[PDB]
Design a binder for this molecule. Structure first.
Ligand SMILES: *Cc1c(COP(=O)(O)O)cnc(C)c1O
Ligand SMILES: *Cc1c(COP(=O)(O)O)cnc(C)c1O
Lengths: 396, 396
C-alpha cells in the first residue's frame, strides 16, 4: 500500500531547522524559523511562564479532560485581548473562542469548519504570505487564490494592487488578513488603510479571517489590534485565529484560539456547535498546559505586569537588532541600501535577497535564511552581527 | 454566511459531561466518559506524573518548537511499549512514530495520510465501536462500513459472524482493530483468535489499523499487546494510533502516537515524510508537556516503577468494582443475570440496558450512562455502589 508513495518535500521553514542541525560548520547562524532569541542566542522560557508553571504544579489536582472548547477563562481572556475590555462583541455575546493547538490548529479548525458548514469555495491569502496558509486551506478542500501586497521595488504596501487584485474576489469568499507583523514582509497597513479595507469587505461581502500571531510585537498589545478592531466594529461575521506561541514564548506547548463572531448570540452559538464537532473529529479536546499558563498569567495582576514587561523587552530588543543590521550593513560595505528594513515590524524583514544569494549564504557561510530571503532579525545578536553582514555582502 | 448553519447534535459521550455538570441534584452519579476515578471519586494526577513534572519545571530551559514528529525518545519509548525491545520492526528500522495530540489526533493524521497518499477509500470499524471512529474517518474523506463483533445475546465475541462480515472487505481496505479493552463491549479476542485474524488479514490484503488506547488495563503492559504483536510479525505494513490518556492519567495534556510500519526503512521513510506533511497542515507540531512527562517516566527506572504500580492499582481497583457491581446488583434483587460483566475488561461494561432504561435512569435517578448502555465501572465506588444498583434494578 505504501510502495508508491513519493517522498514529501521538506517544509521551507520547518525544513531549515533540520539542515542547520545536521550542519557542523562551527560558526553557523540560524535566521530561519520565527522563534525569538535573546542577546546570548537562547530561546528562554519567560519568567512569568516559569512562575505560572510553579503555581500549576502546586495547585493542579486533576488532568481530567478539558471540554471541546478548552478553558473558559482562556477564551474569555483572549477575547478581551483581541477585542478590548467592555467591547460590543463581548457584551452582546456575539463571539465564542475555542482553545486549539497553536494558531495553525486554529487556522485548520476554521478551515474544516467553513469547508463543511458554509458555501465557501476559496480563500484569499496575500502575496507573499506564510507558506503554510496554502497547505492548511488546501487540506480542508479550499482553493486559495492570491491578492497583491508587497511592492518589492520600493519595499512598501502596494495598496492599489492589493485593492485591484481583491476585486476578483466574490461575495462569500474568505479573505485572510495578518493582524499585524505581516509574515514574511513585516509591512502592515496603517489604521486608515485598515478602515478602508474594513469598509470594502462589508460592501463586497467577504468574510474576513485574521491570522493574529504576533500581537504585541509591533507597537503594543492594544495598538496591534486596531486593524482587527476597526473590522469587528463593522463586520457581522468574523473568524480570528490567534497564537500565543511567540508573544508568550510558548512555542512547543501549542496555544492558540479560534474566535468565531456572528451577528448575534443564538447564531454564533449555533455556528460554534459545528466548529466543536470538527474539533471533536480532529484532536478531540485541547492540550491543558500552555493554555492554563496563559490563563494564569493573564488573570493575575502581578504575573501579568511581569509578562507585559518581558514581551516589551522582546519587542524592543528586536527593534535594536533591526537598526544594528542596516548600520553594520552600511559599515561593512553593502552595495545596496537596506534601510527599508527599519520600517518593517516584527521578527522579520524581507531582505530582497535572491534565492541563489540565500542558497549561497547557507552553503558557503552556514548562514541560514529562508529561500524567499526572509531573515529572522530576532535571531541576530551583537556577537553574530558582524560575521552575518559579511556573509551577506560577499554575496551581493 | 452563518445564518443557515444547522446546530450540531451533542457528542454522545462528551455532551453527557455537560448534561451532568448541569443538573443540580445532590447524589447524581456520572458513569459516562472514560476517565478513571479512585475510591474517593476523583481523577487525581498520578504521583509519577507530578514527579516527572517537577523535574521538567526545574530542568526546562526552553519552549522552542519540537519537530513535526515530536520527541524522539517518546517515539522510541512508544515503539518498545508496542512491539517489545528486541522486536524486528525496531532493529530493521521498519517503524516511525509521530507524537500526536492524543489517540484521536493519531487516528486523524493516519486518516488524512491514508486518504491523500494511498488508494484507500473505506475503513472497517467493529459493531459496536467507539462512536468517534466514524466521525474521524468520515472527516478525512473515507467511507466506513461495519463488521460483526458483539453477540448481544450471549455477551461474547461472535467470531464467525465477524469473520464472515470481514470476507466482504477487499484487498486494500483498512480494517480497524482495538488492541485490548474493546470500547464499548470490553470483549477482546483471544491470542489464537488474534493469529487467525492476522493470517486471514495477510491473505485478504487488508491494511490493519490498531487503536491502542488502553495498554495495561486488561492483563498487563506487555500482554495487552500480544494481539498487536501477532499482526506485526506477519504484516509488511500497519499503523497504530495509541493513546497515553488513560494509562498515564494525562487525559487533558493530549498525548498519543501514530506509528507507521512499512516493509522496510526506505519505504517507511518515504511514507512517513507525507505523514509529517499531513501534521504540518493540521496542528504544525505537537504539545510538549505531556509527552515530555511520559518520556521522563519511561526513561527513569524509579519513576517507571512507581507509574507501573499506579497503573496496576487502577486496573485492580477496576476489577474490584466490577465484581462488587454484579454482587450488589445480585443483592438488591436484579431480575437479570449480569455475570458476564465480570468477563469483560477495561473501564467499561456493556450493561445491556435499553435506550429507555438509561434515559429513565438519568432523568429519574441522576445516574448518567451513555445511551448505548455503556457504564464506566471505574466511576463506581463502594460509597455510590448501593444507590446506583438500586437505580439500575428499578428501571428493569
Ligand atoms: C507563527 C505564525 C503562525 C503559527 O503559530 P503556531 O502557534 O506556531 O502554530 C501562523 N500564522 C502566522 C502569521 C505566524 O506568524
Ligand atoms: C479514549 C479512546 C480513544 C482516544 O484516546 P484519546 O487520547 O483520548 O484521544 C480512542 N479509542 C478508544 C477505544 C478510546 O477508548
Amino acid at each position: 500500500m505504501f510502495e508508491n508513495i513519493t517522498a514529501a518535500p521538506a517544509d521551507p521553514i520547518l525544513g531549515l531547522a533540520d539542515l542547520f542541525r545536521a550542519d557542523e560548520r562551527p560558526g553557523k547562524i540560524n535566521l530561519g524559523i520565527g522563534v525569538y532569541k535573546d542577546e546570548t542566542g537562547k530561546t528562554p522560557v519567560l519568567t512569568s511562564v516559569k512562575k505560572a508553571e510553579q503555581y500549576l504544579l502546586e495547585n493542579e489536582t486533576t488532568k481530567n479532560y478539558l471540554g471541546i472548547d478548552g478553558i473558559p477563562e482562556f477564551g474569555r481572556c483572549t477575547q478581551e485581548l483581541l477585542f478590548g475590555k467592555g467591547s460590543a462583541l463581548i457584551n452582546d455575546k456575539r463571539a465564542r473562542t475555542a482553545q486549539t493547538p497553536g494558531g495553525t490548529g486554529a487556522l485548520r479548525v476554521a478551515a474544516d469548519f467553513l469547508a463543511k458548514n458554509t458555501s465557501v469555495k476559496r480563500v484569499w491569502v496575500s502575496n507573499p504570505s506564510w507558506p503554510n496558509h496554502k497547505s492548511v486551506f488546501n487540506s480542508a478542500g479550499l482553493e486559495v487564490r492570491e491578492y497583491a501586497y508587497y511592492d518589492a521595488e520600493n519595499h512598501t504596501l502596494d495598496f492599489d494592487a492589493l485593492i485591484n487584485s481583491l476585486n476578483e474576489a466574490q461575495a462569500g469568499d474568505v479573505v485572510l488578513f495578518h493582524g499585524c507583523c505581516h509574515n514574511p514582509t513585516g509591512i502592515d497597513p496603517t489604521l486608515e488603510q485598515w478602515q478602508t479595507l474594513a469598509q470594502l469587505s462589508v460592501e463586497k461581502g467577504w468574510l474576513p479571517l485574521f491570522d493574529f500571531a504576533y500581537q504585541g510585537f509591533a507597537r503594543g498589545l492594544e495598538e496591534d489590534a486596531e486593524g482587527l478592531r476597526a473590522f469587528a466594529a463593522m463586520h457581522k461575521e468574523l473568524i480570528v485565529a490567534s497564537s500565543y506561541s511567540k508573544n508568550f514564548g510558548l512555542y512547543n506547548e501549542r496555544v492558540g484560539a479560534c474566535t468565531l463572531v456572528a451577528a448575534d448570540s443564538e447564531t454564533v452559538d449555533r455556528a460554534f456547535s459545528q466548529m466543536k464537532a470538527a474539533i471533536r473529529a480532529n484532536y478531540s479536546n485541547p492540550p491543558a498546559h500552555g493554555a492554563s499558563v496563559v490563563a494564569t498569567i493573564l488573570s493575575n495582576d502581578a504575573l501579568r505586569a511581569i509578562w507585559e514587561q518581558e514581551l516589551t523587552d522582546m519587542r524592543q530588543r528586536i527593534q535594536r537588532m533591526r537598526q544594528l543590521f542596516v548600520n553594520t550593513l552600511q559599515e561593512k560595505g553593502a552595495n545596496r541600501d537596506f534601510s527599508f528594513i527599519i520600517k518593517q515590524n516584527g521578527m522579520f524583514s524581507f531582505s530582497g535577497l535572491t534565492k541563489e544569494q540565500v542558497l549561497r549564504l547557507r552553503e558557503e557561510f552556514g548562514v541560514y535564511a529562508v529561500a524567499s530571503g526572509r531573515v529572522n532579525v530576532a535571531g541576530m545578536t551583537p556577537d553574530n552581527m558582524a560575521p552575518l553582514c559579511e556573509a551577506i555582502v560577499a554575496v551581493l
